Amino acid sequence: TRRVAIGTDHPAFAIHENLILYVKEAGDEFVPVYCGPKTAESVDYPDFASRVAEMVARKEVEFGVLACGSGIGMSIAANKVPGVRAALCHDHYTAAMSRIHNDANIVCVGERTTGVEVIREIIITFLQTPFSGEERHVRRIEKIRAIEASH
Amino acid sequence: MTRRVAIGTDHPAFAIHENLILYVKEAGDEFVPVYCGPKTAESVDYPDFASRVAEMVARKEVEFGVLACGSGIGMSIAANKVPGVRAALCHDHYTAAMSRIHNDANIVCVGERTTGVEVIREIIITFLQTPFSGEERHVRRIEKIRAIEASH
Amino acid sequence: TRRVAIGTDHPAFAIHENLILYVKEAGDEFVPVYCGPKTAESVDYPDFASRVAEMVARKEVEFGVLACGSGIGMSIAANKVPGVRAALCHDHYTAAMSRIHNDANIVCVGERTTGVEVIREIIITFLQTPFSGEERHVRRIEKIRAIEASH
Amino acid sequence: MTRRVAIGTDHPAFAIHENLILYVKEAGDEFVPVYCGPKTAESVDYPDFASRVAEMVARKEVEFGVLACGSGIGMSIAANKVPGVRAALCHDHYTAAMSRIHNDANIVCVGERTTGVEVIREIIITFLQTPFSGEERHVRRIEKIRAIEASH
Numbered sequence: 001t002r003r004v005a006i007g008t009d010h011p012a013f014a015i016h017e018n019l020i021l022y023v024k025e026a027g028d029e030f031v032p033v034y035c036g037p038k039t040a041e042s043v044d045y046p047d048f049a050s051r052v053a054e055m056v057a058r059k060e061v062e063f064g065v066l067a068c069g070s071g072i073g074m075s076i077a078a079n080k081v082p083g084v085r086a087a088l089c090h091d092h093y094t095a096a097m098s099r100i101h102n103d104a105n106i107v108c109v110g111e112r113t114t115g116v117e118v119i120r121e122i123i124i125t126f127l128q129t130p131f132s133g134e135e136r137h138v139r140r141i142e143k144i145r146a147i148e149a150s151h
Numbered sequence: 152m153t154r155r156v157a158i159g160t161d162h163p164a165f166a167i168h169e170n171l172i173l174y175v176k177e178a179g180d181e182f183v184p185v186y187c188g189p190k191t192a193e194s195v196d197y198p199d200f201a202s203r204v205a206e207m208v209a210r211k212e213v214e215f216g217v218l219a220c221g222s223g224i225g226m227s228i229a230a231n232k233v234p235g236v237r238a239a240l241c242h243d244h245y246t247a248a249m250s251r252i253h254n255d256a257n258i259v260c261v262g263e264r265t266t267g268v269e270v271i272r273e274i275i276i277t278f279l280q281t282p283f284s285g286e287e288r289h290v291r292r293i294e295k296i297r298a299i300e301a302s303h
Numbered sequence: 304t305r306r307v308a309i310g311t312d313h314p315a316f317a318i319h320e321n322l323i324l325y326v327k328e329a330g331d332e333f334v335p336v337y338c339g340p341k342t343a344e345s346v347d348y349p350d351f352a353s354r355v356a357e358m359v360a361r362k363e364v365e366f367g368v369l370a371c372g373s374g375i376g377m378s379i380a381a382n383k384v385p386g387v388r389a390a391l392c393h394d395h396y397t398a399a400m401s402r403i404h405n406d407a408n409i410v411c412v413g414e415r416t417t418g419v420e421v422i423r424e425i426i427i428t429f430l431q432t433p434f435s436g437e438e439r440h441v442r443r444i445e446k447i448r449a450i451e452a453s454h
Numbered sequence: 455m456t457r458r459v460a461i462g463t464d465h466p467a468f469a470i471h472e473n474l475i476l477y478v479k480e481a482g483d484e485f486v487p488v489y490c491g492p493k494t495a496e497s498v499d500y501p502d503f504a505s506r507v508a509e510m511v512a513r514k515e516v517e518f519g520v521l522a523c524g525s526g527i528g529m530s531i532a533a534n535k536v537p538g539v540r541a542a543l544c545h546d547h548y549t550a551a552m553s554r555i556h557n558d559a560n561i562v563c564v565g566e567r568t569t570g571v572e573v574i575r576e577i578i579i580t581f582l583q584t585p586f587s588g589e590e591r592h593v594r595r596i597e598k599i600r601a602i603e604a605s606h
């Protein structure tokens with residue numbers, strides 16, 4: 001069982017059931033946990049970025065999915081939480097490499113920037129692709145953890 | 152009155168480092184590049200250079216940063232670990248503009264392996280030239296990012 | 304007055320009024336002419352690609368806008384009409400350069416690939432950006448016309 | 455039983471021409487690159503090389519073509535002028551896959567100025583390896599493209 005927490009702001013609300021669906025499409029072991037808004041009225045992305053990022057950091061869930069206008073807001077605010085490696089992806093390549101090289105634990109996408117079928121592909125690829133485990137990446141990821149600790 | 156812009160890369164982006172320097176100048180006379188990346192070909196660790204540039208931005212030694220890696224991802228994660236930093240992974244003109252308009256982003260991140268140099272150029276120029284909107288919901292949202300930083 | 308004919312298939316139907324709106328947003332001189340489907344049921348992209356491309360070729364309208372799943376189908380089928388330079392754009396850069404270098408007369412976009420705000424930006428940039436008029440491009444565009452004539 | 459793949463570029467894509475050759479091989483043993491672009495640095499006219507490769511595909515001398523220019527656009531326009539050709543401008547994995555699945559595309563077009571080499575690699579590989587679906591609505595739509603060609 002690999003839980004994936006889902007967060008959005010208002011531009012991504014209309015596509016939230018899509019994101020739920022795309023998590024389950026990655027495999028039966030992938031369980032979506034919807035932590036986004038309940039209504040379509042404006043909300044502030046940091047509020048929902050924080051909720052999902054804290055769950056990931058605390059290890060309640062293995063993965064996060066965050067959507068907003070461009071995904072930029074989500075990736076900045078999620079990365080403020082220690083333990084989070086939030087990757088803003090715009091295609092299949094960035095989704096795969098975020099996992100292989102960076103061991104990313106949160107994938108961020110933009111609703112106004114990336115079509116839903118590419119959002120589908122991103123989410124599925126992010127979840128299914130393993131971290132390489134290579135020495136250099138393991139070292140670089142540990143160096144990100146050391147930047148957190150120095151602050 | 153002129154605006155400093157620090158540039159960092161790891162090894163795959165080293166091959167285009169004078170490109171990055173050039174594109175910063177291309178945004179206007181008032182933009183001064185500050186090269187902080189691998190002085191040479193050397194395979195290096197992106198978080199070391201993201202930190203160098205991220206710290207300069209957070210200390211207000213430069214106004215903006217430009218970071219390049221393979222996909223841009225490692226640079227955006229590592230730079231966002233520094234409080235005071237809003238580092239945006241951009242891949243086209245629209246994200247470069249909106250990162251500024253909505254998020255008041257102070258670091259632009261790009262991948263050399265994903266995004267062609269003429270779009271990287273367009274990203275950098277758009278980033279540097281586009282102003283923050285100052286609009287109420289955006290200020291409040293940026294403050295909420297700061298409040299998150301304060302809690303950790 | 305610069306008429307712009309608009310064509311879609313079914314995945315782009317839900318966003319057809321968007322495309323109408325984005326044409327007018329480029330300027331008051333830009334007049335949208337909707338030539339896409341009236342209902343959301345499946346249709347074949349070549350049918351609507353051809354209608355718009357023929358209007359452009361015959362010079363009824365100055366410009367075309369075509370949307371489908373990925374935009375690939377639209378750009379292949381529209382380019383089959385002599386006189387058409389249909390450019391599949393996915394960002395601002397490709398929209399600008401399609402006009403500056405290629406003198407493109409039709410812009411093609413994918414609904415499932417490119418978010419509407421980037422589709423907005425593409426359409427506005429395509430319409431507002433002039434052809435450079437440079438010798439080399441004028442020569443290359445004339446060489447495209449010579450490929451048509453040899454078939 | 456092995457599948458030939460002709461490659462053409464103009465001048466900005468010349469710098470990555472052995473990349474393109476390499477990536478075609480990377481899709482499998484059964485893929486044979488056929489280099490047809492500028493043998494040298496020379497500033498050239500994209501329609502001359504789009505034609506060379508487009509004609510080889512239409513004559514069935516090769517099964518696939520790969521075309522690279524600045525933005526990929528001029529290559530897709532010029533190659534689509536040859537009857538029998540379905541040339542797709544792709545910029546990521548999804549368009550590369552769908553061009554094959556839905557449109558049975560026989561030429562892949564890319565921009566060196568817009569799309570980074572590792573994604574160009576991914577585009578080429580995905581294009582070559584992904585099969586046409588053969589599904590009814592797609593066959594009919596492809597035939598309608600042919601019927602358009604016949605009318606001119």
Ligand SMILES: O=C(NO)[C@H](O)[C@H](O)COP(=O)(O)O
Nearest residue numbers: 068069070071072073074253
């Ligand atoms: O894209 C975003 N953050 O990156 C936000 O979703 C975006 O600013 C929301 O904008 P809006 O409040 O005009 O809808």
Ligand SMILES: O=C(NO)[C@H](O)[C@H](O)COP(=O)(O)O
Nearest residue numbers: 101220221222223224225226
């Ligand atoms: O993509 C990146 N960071 O996100 C880095 O540039 C990447 O890890 C470099 O990988 P390499 O060590 O295979 O060159």
Ligand SMILES: O=C(NO)[C@H](O)[C@H](O)COP(=O)(O)O
Nearest residue numbers: 371372373374375376377556
């Ligand atoms: O993207 C397209 N042509 O490029 C078409 O819109 C696409 O094949 C439509 O697919 P569908 O018939 O499964 O909706």
Ligand SMILES: O=C(NO)[C@H](O)[C@H](O)COP(=O)(O)O
Nearest residue numbers: 404523524525526527528529
């Ligand atoms: O983008 C292209 N065709 O679409 C071409 O590579 C482009 O016209 C080359 O332009 P240049 O003549 O400035 O190098």
